[PDB]
Each structure stands twice: as structure tokens, then as C-alpha cells.
Amino acid sequence: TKPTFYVCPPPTGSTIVRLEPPRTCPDYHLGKNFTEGIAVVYKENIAAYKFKATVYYKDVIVSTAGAGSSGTQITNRYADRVPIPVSEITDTIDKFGKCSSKATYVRNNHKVEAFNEDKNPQDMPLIASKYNSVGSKAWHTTNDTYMVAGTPGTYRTGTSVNCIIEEVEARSIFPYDSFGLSTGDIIYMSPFFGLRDGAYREHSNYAMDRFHQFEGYRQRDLDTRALLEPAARNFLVTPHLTVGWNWKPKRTEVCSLVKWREVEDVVRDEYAHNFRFTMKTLSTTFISETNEFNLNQIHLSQCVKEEARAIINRIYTTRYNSSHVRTGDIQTYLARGGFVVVFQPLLSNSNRTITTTSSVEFAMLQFTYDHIQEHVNEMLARISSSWCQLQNRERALWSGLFPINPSALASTILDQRVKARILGDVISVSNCPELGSDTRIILQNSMRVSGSTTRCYSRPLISIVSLNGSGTVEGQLGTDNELIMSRDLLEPCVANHKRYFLFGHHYVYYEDYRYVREIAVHDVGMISTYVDLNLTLLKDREFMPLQVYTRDELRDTGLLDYSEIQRRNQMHSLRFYDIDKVVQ
Amino acid sequence: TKPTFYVCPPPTGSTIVRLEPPRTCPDYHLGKNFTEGIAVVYKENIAAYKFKATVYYKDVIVSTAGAGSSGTQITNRYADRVPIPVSEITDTIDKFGKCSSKATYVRNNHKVEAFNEDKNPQDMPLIASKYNSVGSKAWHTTNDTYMVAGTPGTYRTGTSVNCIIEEVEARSIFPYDSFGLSTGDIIYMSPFFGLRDGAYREHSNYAMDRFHQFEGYRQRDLDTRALLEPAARNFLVTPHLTVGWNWKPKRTEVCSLVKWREVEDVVRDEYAHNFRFTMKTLSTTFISETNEFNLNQIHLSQCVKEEARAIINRIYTTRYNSSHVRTGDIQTYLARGGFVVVFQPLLSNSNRTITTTSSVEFAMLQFTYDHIQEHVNEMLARISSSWCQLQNRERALWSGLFPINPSALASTILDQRVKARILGDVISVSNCPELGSDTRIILQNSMRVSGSTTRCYSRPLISIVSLNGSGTVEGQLGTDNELIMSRDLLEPCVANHKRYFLFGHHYVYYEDYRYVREIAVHDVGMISTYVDLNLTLLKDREFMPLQVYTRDELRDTGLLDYSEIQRRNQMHSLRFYDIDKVVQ
Amino acid sequence: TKPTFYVCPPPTGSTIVRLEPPRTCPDYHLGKNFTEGIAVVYKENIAAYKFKATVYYKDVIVSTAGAGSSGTQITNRYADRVPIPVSEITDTIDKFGKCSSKATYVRNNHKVEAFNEDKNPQDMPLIASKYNSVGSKAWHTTNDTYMVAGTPGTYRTGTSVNCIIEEVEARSIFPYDSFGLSTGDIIYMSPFFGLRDGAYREHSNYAMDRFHQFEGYRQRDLDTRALLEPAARNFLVTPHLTVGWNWKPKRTEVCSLVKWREVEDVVRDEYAHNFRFTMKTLSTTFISETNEFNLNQIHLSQCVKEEARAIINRIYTTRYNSSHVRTGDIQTYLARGGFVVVFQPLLSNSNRTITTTSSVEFAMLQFTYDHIQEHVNEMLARISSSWCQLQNRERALWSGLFPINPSALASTILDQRVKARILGDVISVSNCPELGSDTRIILQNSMRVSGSTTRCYSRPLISIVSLNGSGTVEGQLGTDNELIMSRDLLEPCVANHKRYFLFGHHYVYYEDYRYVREIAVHDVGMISTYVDLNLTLLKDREFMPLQVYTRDELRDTGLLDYSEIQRRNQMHSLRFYDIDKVVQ
Ligand SMILES: *[C@@H]1O[C@H](CO)[C@@H](O[C@@H]2O[C@H](CO)[C@@H](O[C@@H]3O[C@H](CO[C@H]4O[C@H](CO[C@H]5O[C@H](CO)[C@@H](O)[C@H](O)[C@@H]5O)[C@@H](O)[C@H](O[C@H]5O[C@H](CO)[C@@H](O)[C@H](O)[C@@H]5O)[C@@H]4O)[C@@H](O)[C@H](O[C@H]4O[C@H](CO)[C@@H](O)[C@H](O)[C@@H]4O)[C@@H]3O)[C@H](O)[C@H]2NC(C)=O)[C@H](O)[C@H]1NC(C)=O
Ligand SMILES: *[C@@H]1O[C@H](CO)[C@@H](O[C@@H]2O[C@H](CO)[C@@H](O[C@@H]3O[C@H](CO[C@H]4O[C@H](CO[C@H]5O[C@H](CO)[C@@H](O)[C@H](O)[C@@H]5O)[C@@H](O)[C@H](O[C@H]5O[C@H](CO)[C@@H](O)[C@H](O)[C@@H]5O)[C@@H]4O)[C@@H](O)[C@H](O[C@H]4O[C@H](CO)[C@@H](O)[C@H](O)[C@@H]4O)[C@@H]3O)[C@H](O)[C@H]2NC(C)=O)[C@H](O)[C@H]1NC(C)=O
Ligand SMILES: *[C@@H]1O[C@H](CO)[C@@H](O[C@@H]2O[C@H](CO)[C@@H](O[C@@H]3O[C@H](CO[C@H]4O[C@H](CO[C@H]5O[C@H](CO)[C@@H](O)[C@H](O)[C@@H]5O)[C@@H](O)[C@H](O[C@H]5O[C@H](CO)[C@@H](O)[C@H](O)[C@@H]5O)[C@@H]4O)[C@@H](O)[C@H](O[C@H]4O[C@H](CO)[C@@H](O)[C@H](O)[C@@H]4O)[C@@H]3O)[C@H](O)[C@H]2NC(C)=O)[C@H](O)[C@H]1NC(C)=O
Ligand SMILES: *[C@@H]1O[C@H](CO)[C@@H](O)[C@H](O)[C@H]1NC(C)=O
Ligand SMILES: *[C@@H]1O[C@H](CO)[C@@H](O)[C@H](O)[C@H]1NC(C)=O
Ligand SMILES: *[C@@H]1O[C@H](CO)[C@@H](O)[C@H](O)[C@H]1NC(C)=O
């Protein structure tokens, strides 16, 4: 309980002030030039090129067995896969669905031969393998591996020739100098090698006499026994097999870029000296330079422009035909992360390769930040602008009310207890020091004027007693604990006089110009001019490196791992034999 | 320096206005119906099924050597892996820890045999390989590869049989029609094939006589020489090895879904016609349809419901037992990205497969945007609501103060210099045009009234001189550079008269009703009614496609790459020989 | 159209209130202690160690051919790769660029030999393979595979020995106990095995006599025929090849951590009991414990401290030399996600392994949330602070204007129609009930006072008629539809009297103290004290699990898949033969 009182000497012209004129209201130069449009986004093509081929070979197996007392012992099993010559394929397999039981091939630089069962050659019917199914089909001529034992003491040799044709899956990866077959065999020729249309400049590691190409060739369907439709067919004979595949030109088969997403609602704007492609349907934003990117700098990029045009046309005439018009030709941009943006601008009526990143998350982040930034910026700019207009409006209240109570308004603006006077169009102020220690303040009981019955004091009389005996002042209780050094606040005595005057931390209650009681300030109910506004803060948050699958998991999805099998199995000599022991 | 003055004709009833009544305060219908709960989130299981098996085989190696003058030359080395028959495994390996030095097998459709060292069969002790360690263990019967040279001019043949048993790791991937062994061998039978409990309908590519199953079988621990515990054991004999493994039913061994995260604090709400699962402990939000998802549409999904229940029970009775209650049975939902949400609703006291995406980042983005949106929306709604209440409160000030200075308040509201009068409950206004060119304004020195000593002008006298000679008006200086066309602002002459009046861009200072000096407006200190508010904007930001490991890096972690080894090594014939040369 | 009127009994002292004093303005204790700095961030090294090696072997191929009537048949082709002994490499290959046409090796625990063309040994020149190119180079001694047929009825055997040297790529993965060669061969020795500097404690599975190390060894460049520069060279002879490589110590060759990013602008602060490393140039934030992390707990982490120092020095003296100073030695922290932060604090003038996560997105999220949080928090705190100051300033208007119209101000604050009086420093209020049903209100035409010509009513006379006959009151029309129960609002009659008084939902127009017409409130133009503020909300947004490449795509980039090749090709016996058929 510490009551502070004030004393207010009259204002000399020592300190004159004026009310600050209205402020110029802020301007945030938001609003950007944009352009609506359609986009097709492309990514680096990382997928192998896939096609169908057929392998033609013979399993040749030569076995030497010795018969003994106990039984038969195999002394040698020489197994070899040999290519079926093109002549056999064209004149026997594809005409009759048969294959010779004699293998005719070269090995160790010699023309050599082998006869199934060591009998005279017959053209054997090609029969579907029992595991044939939709997917992988194959045909063969025997189920047997001919070998002959004979009578004890002797070594006999027998030959097995099994003529085999498999349909296989072929794969090739950029730059397409070779292809791999699902038998494990690698073919060191481009899948696009041929004799027409410059295709003879494709890569190959084989002498030309191993390669054959037949226009309008007709392959036999071994199951239906019928001829399939004519197509240019390649045959290449390698030392272990012949491969056959239907030739297609490279131009129509591979592309280094592939469609990632076609995008109907796109807005492009100039943003930090770049182009920004905001795609609200993907919650994704891509950023390129303002310069178009020339796709001709990229190997095999021909598919993109044409395919993009067709897509964009489909878009335009389906959802934009009435509403917008195209304002130029298509444009192409290289976005951050290695994405190719193919952009068609609209208007409403009113030699490298590209490496594409593995995640578009950064571009979703980019979108999410931009969206939030744009929205809170626009809202902050409105608050800011409205606040300014509000202060400027309210100045008129301050200015209009100032003559009614200059001291009270000035004291609030200056955050300081002052006395103020109006001097024409200007305010004159003076400081009201706090009443000091060693002073006592006595409240007088009567607000009546001595010797009058019609004239009263409008506020209580007080005497200010110096406790050290300097003197006593006869003043009155002003407002807000101000003490006035005179008694010139007077009024006509009213009937039914009831007043509460603030006195320190109490209200002091008078009736009929006489003191009645002291009341605690806290005993008087409050009403509030304060409009509540309760703003709280965004709290701290820690994001964890959440993963769906670890790197270990993602490498643990396959049947076998090559390196693991090799590590374990090349030990075999070391684990089960002594490689260091030498018999003398 | 350009001073503008105004002239204000009295308001006719031509333009009467009223003060806009209080506005209805905005309502943002925020607040959503939610439901607390517990969740277990599942993901597509991509991991191979892993189990232990044992392989039983014999290395058979037949060598033919010729002795010469110089030394010995190996002419042939025929090597073959042969299966150990089940009878040998059950009656010799598992009873005695021994294996016959004679291999008895079929090859080329013939029963054939081989004798270690070409001697009579003995049951050889199985001995641990020197590389045995925790991890991979194996046993064998010899360290030698028997071969015999003999005397020059002759060819001798010798046989090595080394009986080998390895513990191996087995792997199988969905749909579990086969399994791969760490020897590289593929077994074309389900690991779950057996004779009991429908297991005989599992896939197999082998004739039944190759398969054996023994209930309560007891395998011998070759190292401790003791019998291990009884279990149903499979044996399958293939042409190169016999495999043994302990059979377990499929139901208990594999599941197509696997636990990703159990989640204690979950809130579900209806959000854009969907269910939203906000998980503040993961900073992650998942979104499904409101319809439950029936797990029975998914192959091998039985593990999920039971495991989830047990987990959820653990959660409930450990941290929620006192505080909440379960308000139903468990529910299951399919969330965006291929996550299965198993959700238990709470209340406080008061045939396909599923493909799961590789990243949950989108769901963390989803969380982060939602959290930010919810918070700034709620705060914007409070600002907006408080602002409205504030304008409505302040209207009372405008209305109450209006009779004191109608012109000044109206001029600020209309942003236009007007003169206003109160006509009862209505405001009457008129426009105050700017004083034009070709006019000069002379300030009179004296504010005293001619012929009086008790009566004065309350503001300075001015004469308005038309510079073209139209006439002179005798008026006075009003407020804010208004010029009044009369001289009826009068007051009793006070003592100590000091006034500053605004006159163009100067204050004009009078004392005792006489002009004293001109003072520049900028020479008078300001006090401000403007409460400062300094809001700045979120700045532009560019996010880069940051990667930890590129695709190249992630494929560069293994010892060998299969395709690379093949590309390089199938060239071998081409690189070091001439395959095209034919000797005649 | 429902007009409500009020009646206001005079306020007794029953309800006295006071104006709430100014509120203490909120304090948000924002502002954090930070420290500027430089960082180098490290990640788990997952890349294989790569080096160059050379393999030395001989292809030995023994062929037996039988001549017949028809032609030649190959009966056996025994092929073997044999190691070239170190003596041959040091004394013949590296001195003369030649290799013996005789292979001398061990197999089946016997010293054995082979002669190219079965002729006497010659030292054959090593010749570059025709496929030699920048990348992979190799040399050999013959292009032929010698074999001999002879005359019919006979079997002849011939031997081919082709001496081969290839440059290969070598790979090793942690913990570096072995290495893989690009021929497919695994070498079961550390690439860092040697005889110096403790290197003899590295792993090896080979007897020591297979290993050789030569200090200052000089390898021959087979193409230039010149000796290369001296270096410590290892040779290891395995049963199929000899490997040669230039030895380097492990310390300088491998590290378990690798630089991810050097970072110039870094700010560290204490945040949720942790250290926060905000990196505005990466839009990425990392979080560690406040405790430094001791790198000595990690295998092979020596490269980090030294390399980091050098990098940081480069940074400091290039961009910070004048502006800041280093305030300590370098510090190292383990951040969430498995990143190692190497941090150098600045001041302006004024045994495990670490697993690093695959994505830094969470740390970009962390940055983006922090940045947004910091900015809207700081702005909310300013709004909140300015709002409070504004209410406190405006209280002075409420307080100063209160004596002019206590009822109107109190009615707005209390949101209730009250009558208020000032009783000294306190407000006395009373409720003004709505005028009830069954009452009719008649407006009197004349505001003139009967019997006077100089005295008038200041507002219209009204009579309040009880429709049930309780009586009539003669009062007047107060403000805002208040009805006053007396007629004591009087004024001197003015000239040109024109007033509009609100009466229900009409204004009622008087001239010269006489009624003239009724005017609809909506016919009187409004001016507004309401400053507009239009805030809208962030809208709902759904983020989709966007992927650039699916898991399928990322596994579809290679030429061949090992598991696929094996699955398909180990069927071969089953698909094209009958393995179950036994010939008797
Ligand atoms: C090497 O020897 C093998 C045998 O060891 C031999 O394999 C046969 O290969 C032929 C193709 O050349 C297969 O014929 C196909 O059979 C398909 C249906 O197979 C299922 O049903 C069989 C029921 O009997 C069929 O055949 C018999 C006569 O044998 C006949 O009476 C019936 O009407 C019926 O047609 C059944 O035997 C078979 O069982 C095998 O597969 C199961 C899989 O679970 C396995 O577990 C068994 O152990 C067994 O191996 C199976 O259940 C049939 O759909 C298919 O038809 C296609 O082609 C025809 C044209 O002919 C089209 O009309 C039709 O639309 C289809 O496209 C085809 O006919 C035959 O099944 C094999 N035999 C065996 C025992 O499996 C090889 O030919 C020999 N090779 C050489 C070089 O000689
Ligand atoms: C084919 O020939 C090979 C040899 O060329 C032969 O290999 C032996 O295989 C047996 C198992 O059959 C191995 O025995 C194991 O040895 C473990 C400890 O090995 C370390 O210590 C050895 C020290 O000598 C041991 O043995 C000698 C007698 O030889 C004895 O005096 C000692 O007390 C001691 O027991 C040491 O030789 C060995 O060195 C090899 O490995 C190092 C690795 O750095 C390599 O660099 C060397 O070049 C060398 O190859 C190594 O340092 C032992 O812990 C283990 O015990 C397990 O089983 C027993 C039961 O017997 C349990 O009681 C125990 O808890 C363990 O589970 C086991 O005894 C032996 O080491 C091999 N010998 C060699 C030279 O390595 C094969 O058996 C032959 N195979 C056939 C078919 O004949
Ligand atoms: C096994 O037999 C094969 C042949 O079947 C034989 O292969 C030769 O290997 C030698 C190296 O030992 C190769 O020599 C190299 O040739 C490089 C240029 O090759 C291109 O140009 C050739 C044009 O003729 C060259 O040689 C002739 C004489 O033959 C000469 O007149 C010319 O001036 C010219 O030098 C051309 O033959 C060759 O064609 C092959 O490759 C194409 C690729 O498209 C393929 O399609 C063909 O079918 C054919 O296989 C090719 O176009 C040359 O740059 C290189 O030079 C390097 O080394 C020298 C040092 O000698 C440096 O000075 C120089 O800076 C380079 O570093 C090198 O001279 C030769 O090309 C092979 N021959 C053939 C036919 O390809 C093996 O040697 C035999 N091995 C054994 C053990 O005997
Ligand atoms: C008492 O105090 C007053 C002011 O507080 C001072 O002016 C005066 O000198 C003091 N009187 C005595 C007697 O000390
Ligand atoms: C001078 O100007 C006044 C108004 O500015 C105009 O009314 C008057 O016609 C002018 N007088 C002459 C003589 O042109
Ligand atoms: C008429 O109404 C008044 C107040 O509305 C009530 O006091 C009075 O009793 C009523 N008079 C009659 C006759 O019912």
C-alpha cells in the first residue's frame, strides 16, 4: 500500500508541443505479373529398353562311360551349346518346324560335327517344353541324354544332340551398343543394327558374315504350325547360339526423356530473376532460368516435342477451348532437379544427358513455403495498412477532445504526469512532480463554503502538512491524486449531493457536502474499455528422420545376391580341400 | 513551400448524413469434431523370407593324366556335384556322423557310381571345415583330390569323391514358389511344401519321389555328436544336391504387411470428405477414406489384426487405463501412400497386394502445413474478431465527440475538408473549396476590438486581397488554415494572453493581443498519438534438390556387379582368340 | 419492421462502477543466444574402395578329337585358367615383355604342365588385344586354340596354352578383408595386406608362400616397352590366377566418413535442450546434443578432423579474415540422421559405425518450420504488443469524453442500454428497460412552448398511451429511441430551425418547430467510422505421395538381373530333358 500524489505547477511557455500530423500509410508492392498455361514435365529415362528375341541352339553332350564289376562310371561329360546356322533356321525350322539331329559347327577353329545317338541325321519335330506358359515358351527335339556303357573293361563314348529354341526377353541400356538376353547371354551388337536407314553405323563387335537381315521375313509359330506376319528380321550367329529378333529403327524405340506428369493448371511468374512454375494440383513448384532450354543438346530427345504438343492439344481443346487462347508456340525449360518443363502459355478472354534427381520433395517444399509466404504476407500487409489508417482516423479524436482535458490526454501520450494548456493551436505542458516524503495529507470533512449556503466546494478540501514544520498549505483534492495548491474549484450547492473522490488507494465518499466513509478502490466494480486479443505462439517442433524402408531393406528384396554368392562359393577349394599340398 | 487555405460556406440541408451503425462481427466457423485414439501403422512387406537349410552333396572329380618325358599333363578333369540319397542321410550321416566314399547317383538317365581313390567304399567320418565359425559351418570327408599319373606313354584315370554337408541360408520371395540357397542354387519348390495342413497344394516342380518328409525327425549335430530336437524335416533330392530343412506352415511364417510404427497419440477428424489421422509425435499425418478397408482383399494379411490388437491392448492398459475408454472395436483404413492404419477410438472420461510408397515426407509436409494453417487461421480469426469489436466500441467515441467539433471529425471520415453541423440526430455537411490563386492574405497585427478594452478577437484578423482588384474581405484566421469570411469570433480579453496560431506553414505568435513573430511549424516539437506497428514480410527462399546419396552412389556399395562382370567377361573369346578363323 | 423504444429511470447509487486501469502489456521473451560459425558436414561413406590391379594367367585348353567318315567330332574340351608364377612375371614378363608357351602349375595336388601346340617352350611376345582402349587393356600370346584331328578311326589330343595379362578394376568393401576383381574373381586377402607398418596383421586366407611383396618394384609397360616408376608391389598366386597390385597403406586410402557439404554461413543456438545448426544457404537445419561427439568411437575416422581443419581454414581466411575471429578450437557433433557436424565458432568484432539416413528432407522441413515459426511469432508478438499499447492510449479518450455523454459510452461498454451519471470520480448506472407491448406513441406536431415566443422544446413532444387505459404520459423524444418521462429539454427558439430526429426506424423532420415529414432511415446516406480489415484463411490442401521413380523403376536400370537369370536358367535340365527317366 503505497499512495503517490502529484503537484502541478502552471505551464509556462517553456515547453510547447503540437500533435504529429497523419502518417503516410505503408505500401507493400505485392502483386506479381503471371501467365496461365499448360505443362508436360519430363524426367531422365532410366529404364532399360526391352524387346523380344529368340535364341536358336543345340545342346551337345558327349559322355564317356566305363563299365566295371560293380557298375557304370562316368569318366567324362563334355557339354557345349552350339549355334544353329541360319540356313537350318530359314530352310528347316521355319518351313517345317523341324531341326536336324546333327549339329554342324565350328570350335577350336575347326568345322566339327555331332550326331544325336551317333546315328544318321534326321529332321526331328520341334516339341513344346512341358513348362510352356504365357510368358516363356520354348521348343526342343529330345528329352534324352544318350550315353552308352557296354561290357566291363571297356570305355564307350556316346553323343547327345538336343536342338533347342527359346523365346527370350532382351534388354539394352544406353547408349545401346549391346543387349542382354534372359538366358544370361550378352550380345555385343546394338539391338538397332541393320542394313537400312543408316542402321549399319550402329555398334557391333562381330564380323559381318555372322549377321543376316531379311526383309519381309516370315517366322513360323511352332505351336500353331502357321507362318506369322512378315517383318524385317535379324539373325546373328555367335559361338554358342544364334539370336533372332525383329528389327525396329532406333528413332522410334528409345528416348532419353520420359513423361513424368502432364499438368493442366500451371502458373508461371518471374521470381528472383528466374521463372517459377507453380502447379497447385501437384502442390509442387519448379524453377528454371528465364532462357528457354534447347533440347537438341540432348541425345535422343526427339520424342519430347511431338508427344508434348499432342498432349497439350488434348488439354487445350478439352478444358480451355472456350475460356483461353494460346499466346505463342510451346516453350521448353530446364528446371532445378533435372526436370524438363514443356510449357504452353495461355490468356483468358479478359551433347549431354540430363540427370534427374530422385525426389521431388524439395519442389513440394518450395510450393508449401511460397503458398504460406504469399498468404501471410498479404495478410500482414492488410493488418499493417488498416492499422495505419486506424491511427490516422483516431488522431481526430485526440485532436477534437484535447480542449476538454488537455492534461489527461497529454499525460497519456507522454507517459508522464503533466499539466497541459491550449495556447491557440498549440499545447503547453509542464511536469507534475510526485509529492515527496515527510508530508502528511489531511482530508477536511466539509465541502461547504464558510458563511455561504448557496456556494460549495466542488471537490474535497485538503491540508498539506510538512512533517518537519515548513508550513501548511490549504488546497483541494484534484483528479487522479493530484493535489491543488488553491481552493478555487467551486460550484452552486446541489440537492442530493453524492460524490466519490479518489484519494490514494481509497475512494472517499461524501453526501451533502460532508465526509461519510472510506471505501477501498477494489470494492468498486470495474467496466473495461480494453478489447481483448489473445495471441499465442507457434510451438517448437522436432522432425525426425522418418524412413519407410532403410537402405538395408531396399537391398533385401531379391532372391539371391551375386556378391554374396560369389564370396561364399569361391571359397569352395579352400574350405573343403588342401590347395597347398603337393604329392611327390 | 506551398501553403493551401480553405474557405467554408455554411451547410445547407443539401447533404445530410448519419453515422453507420455497428457492424456484425465476422464468424469463422473453426473448431472440428475429432476423436482421440491409438494407432498401429503397417507397410508393404518387401523383405525376403529367410530360413535355415542344409545341403548334402558329393564332389565327384574324375581326372585323366598322361605322363611324359618332361612331366605330367592333365588331359581331362571331369567335375560333378551329386546328391546324397536320403537313405545315406537318415541311416549313416544322422546315425554315425559318417558318409560313404562311394557316390551312387543318376546322370544321363543312368545309375552310375564313383569311388574315392578307386578303392572299396568306407564310411568316412565327417570333419568340420577349417573355416567353420559362428555363421557358416560345413563338414567334409577328405582334403585330397585323388589323381594318378603313372609311367610315361600312358594315360591313367583316377577318381576323387569328397562328401560335403553345408549349413546354408535360404531365401524366398512372394508368392513363395521357390527358394534360393546361399550356394547359388535355386530350389523350385515352395519352402512351405509338406504333407500336412493343406501344404501339399504348395508349388513344386519336382516328381513326388524326390520329396520326403519325416515327422519328429532328429538331425545329428556333427560337432557335438549329439541328436538335436525332433522336428518335421523335409528332404528334396535334385540332380546336383539334396536339401534338408525343418518344415513350418506358411500361415505363421510370412505376412504381406509389416509394422512400421505404433502410435500412442493419434487424433482422427473428418477433413475434406476424408478421415485425417494427425500424429503429433511423428509430425506426420495420414489420410484415408471414411470407409473402413477390408484386409481380406489382401493375400497373407492375417498377421495384422491379431498383432495390432495385442499392441493396442498394451498401449491402452499402460497409459490410458485410468484416463480414457475404448468406444468400439478396432478399425482399419487404407491411407494415401499405401499405409494400413489400425485405429482404436477412445474417449476421455469428460485379391490384391498393397504397394507402399518409399517416402513418408509428403505426410510430414501434410502435418506441417495443417499445423501452421490451423494456428495462423485461429490467430487471424482472433485479430479479425477483435478488430471488429474495437471499431464498434470506438464508434461511441466518434458519436459522443461529434457535437464538440462536427467539421473536424467529418473532414477526417470523409477524407475531405468539409464544414459540418448537427441537425438533431443527423449531420449536415458542405464542401470547403481550396482558396485559389491570384489572392494575397494579410495578417493584422492587433486582435484588439476598436473602441473596447474588455472585448477582443479570439483569433487573428486577416484581410483577403484579390490581386486582380475584385475586392477585399475582412475575415479571421480559423483553424487548420481555414479562412473565415467574418469577424464574429470574440472573447473577453484575458491577462497573460499568449497564443500560437497556424498560418500556412508557420505558427504565428501573439502576446497581449498583438503580433510578435513568425515561427516555423518544424520548430515546434511533436508528440504522437500514433502507436507504432512494424510488420515485415517473409522473404523469398529457394530450396535446392539436396541429396545425401545420388543414384550412382546407392548402386556403388556392393563387392561386384553382375552385369558389369558379364559384359567384360563374355568378351573373352573375342579379346584373346580369333573366333572367325577356320583351319582347313 | 419492429421499432424498440427505451425508458430510463434515474440512477440511484445502487450500481457504481469505475473504469478499469491500463493493463500490463504482454511480454514474449523471444530472442535467443546464438553463435555464428563455419561447418563441414560429413556422412557415412557407403562407396566401395576402388583401385587398379593386374591379373596374370594362362588359358590352358586340352582337346580330344575323333576323325570319322563324315568329319571331325570333338570328344572332350578340358579348359583351365592357371596362375603365372611370380618368377615368370619378374624375370620374363617384366624384363622382356614375353611369356613362356609352357604352363607350369599345380592341380589335384600335383605339379603338372602344358605345352602350346605340344611343342617345345618358347618365350612368346605379349601382344595387345584388339579391343584395347582407354579403360581396359590386355595382352596375350596367341589367337589360336590348337587342336588336331588326324586320320579316321583315331582319337588325337592337342594342347593350347594362351598366356594372358589383363588390367582390371578392383573393389573392396568394409571392413576390407577381401577384394573383387572385374574378371569376377574374389581375392580373399585385404587390399592393404603387406609386410610394412603393421600391414601384415590385415586379413588373409592364403598361406604366406603365395604372397610376395617387392619394394621399389618396376612394372613393365607392355605397350611402350618401357619400365614404369618404382613402387611397392604385391603379388598373390591363387589356384587360377596371379594378381598384382601396387600396395598403399590403409590409413591413407579409406575413411568411414565422407564430406557431404562445407557450409559457410552457420548459426548455432540452444534449442529444446539441444544444439540447433541453422544453415540458411542450404535451407537445412541439423540438431545434435550439446555434448561434443568423440569421433574416436568410430572405425577409420581419422580423415575427418584434418580435412575439416583445412577446409575451415580456407573458409576463415577467405571470407571472414577481417570480420570475425575464431573463439576456440573446432568442435564435432552427432546430428539427428547420422550426420557429423564439424563446427568452428566465430565472433564478429562487435567401436561403432555411423548409419546416415538416405534423405535430408526432414532437416529441410525442420528449417522451413523454424523460419516460418520465428517470423510469425515475432509478428504476432508485435501485433499483440501494439494492440495493448493502443487500448491503453485509447482509455484516455474514454475517460476524457465520459463526462460529455456518460450514458452513451457506458451503454456501449456494457453492451446494454443504461443511463449513467458522473458522481465525482465514479460512474453510476441504471438499466433502461425496453418499452413494452400494449403501448402507443403519438408524436406531437409542435415543439413550441404554449404562451411563449422566445422559448421552445429542443426535441419533439410525445405522448405515451397505454392501450389498456392505465393512463397517458406527456414526455419527449430523447436520443436513440429513448422516451423521456418529462418535458424539461428546452432551448431559446432559433431562426432557421431544421432538425431530424430518430423515431423508431424513421427520421422525423421538423422545420420552425413544426413537424413536416417522415423519412426512412435508409434514405439518409451513411458515413463510416469503421476501418475495413479483410482477413481470409489458409485453405485446406492435400499433398500426394509424388514419386519421380518407383522402386520398380529404380531396379530396372541394369543390363541383367542375377536372380532372374538364375531362376530361368537352372530350370534348363527340367525344361528340355526328363531327369526322372532311368534306362535299365
Ligand atoms: C519331354 O517330356 C515331357 C513329359 O515328361 C513332355 O511334356 C509334355 O509337353 C507337352 C507339350 O509338348 C504338354 O502338353 C501341354 O499340356 C498342357 C496341360 O498340362 C496339364 O494337364 C495335363 C493333362 O493331360 C494332358 O495331356 C494328356 C496326354 O498326355 C491328355 O490326355 C489330356 O487331355 C491333357 O491334354 C497334365 O499332364 C499336366 O501335368 C504336368 O504339369 C503339371 C503342372 O502342375 C506337373 O505338376 C506335372 O508333373 C506334369 O508335368 C498339366 O497338369 C496343355 O494345356 C497344353 O496345351 C497347349 O498347347 C495345345 C496344343 O497342343 C493348345 O491346344 C492349348 O491351347 C495350349 O496352348 C499342352 O498340350 C504336356 O503336358 C507335357 N507332359 C507332361 C507329362 O507334363 C515333353 O513334350 C517332352 N518333350 C519332347 C521334346 O519330347
Ligand atoms: C583339411 O585340412 C585342414 C587343415 O589344412 C583341417 O583343418 C582343421 O580343421 C579343424 C576342424 O576340423 C580345425 O579345428 C578348429 O580349430 C579352432 C582354432 O583354430 C585356431 O587355432 C589353431 C591352433 O591349434 C589348434 O589345433 C591344434 C592341433 O592342430 C591344437 O594343438 C591346439 O590346441 C588348437 O586346438 C590354429 O591351427 C588355427 O589356424 C588356422 O586358422 C588361421 C586363422 O587365422 C589360419 O590363418 C591358419 O592358416 C590356419 O588355417 C586357428 O588359429 C578351434 O577353435 C575349433 O574348436 C571348435 O570345435 C571344437 C571341437 O573340436 C570345440 O571344442 C570348440 O569349442 C570350437 O567349436 C576347432 O577345433 C583346425 O584348426 C584346422 N586346422 C588348421 C591347420 O587350420 C581340416 O580338418 C581337414 N579336413 C578334413 C576333411 O580332413
Ligand atoms: C589377334 O588377332 C587380332 C586380329 O584379328 C589382332 O588384332 C590387332 O591388334 C592390334 C594390337 O595388337 C591392333 O592394333 C591397334 O590398332 C588401332 C587402330 O585400329 C583401327 O584401325 C585399324 C586400321 O589399320 C591399322 O593397322 C594396320 C595394319 O593392320 C595399318 O596398316 C594401319 O596403319 C592401322 O595402324 C583397323 O584394322 C581396326 O579395325 C578393327 O577394329 C574395328 C573397330 O571398329 C573393328 O570393327 C574391326 O573389325 C577390326 O577388328 C581399327 O579400325 C591403333 O590405334 C592402335 O594403336 C595403339 O597402339 C599403338 C602401338 O602399336 C600406338 O602407337 C597408338 O598410339 C595406340 O595406343 C593399335 O596399333 C589391330 O588393330 C588389331 N587388328 C585388327 C584386325 O583389329 C591381335 O593383335 C592378335 N593377337 C595376337 C596375340 O596375335
Ligand atoms: C522540510 O522539508 C522541506 C521540503 O520537503 C524543505 O524545504 C525544508 O527545508 C525542511 N525544513 C526543515 C526545517 O528542515
Ligand atoms: C478576379 O478573380 C476573381 C475570382 O478569383 C473573379 O471573380 C474576377 O472576375 C476577377 N476580376 C477581374 C477584373 O478579372
Ligand atoms: C395495462 O398495462 C399496464 C402496464 O403495461 C399495467 O400496469 C396495468 O395493470 C394494465 N391495466 C389494466 C386495466 O389491465
Author numbering:
A (entry chain A), B (entry chain A), C (entry chain A): 115 to 464, 503 to 736
What did the published study say regarding this structure?
Varicella-zoster virus (VZV) is a highly infectious, human host restricted alphaherpesvirus that causes varicella (chickenpox), establishes latency in sensory ganglion neurons and can reactivate to manifest as zoster (shingles). Herpesvirus virions have an outer lipid membrane studded with glycoproteins that enable fusion with cell membranes to initiate entry and establish infection. The most conserved herpesvirus protein, glycoprotein B (gB), is classified as a type III fusogen due to its structural similarities with vesicular stomatitis virus (VSV) G protein and baculovirus gp64. In contrast to these fusogens, gB requires additional virally encoded glycoproteins, gH and gL, which are implicated in membrane binding and priming of the gB trimer, to induce membrane fusion.
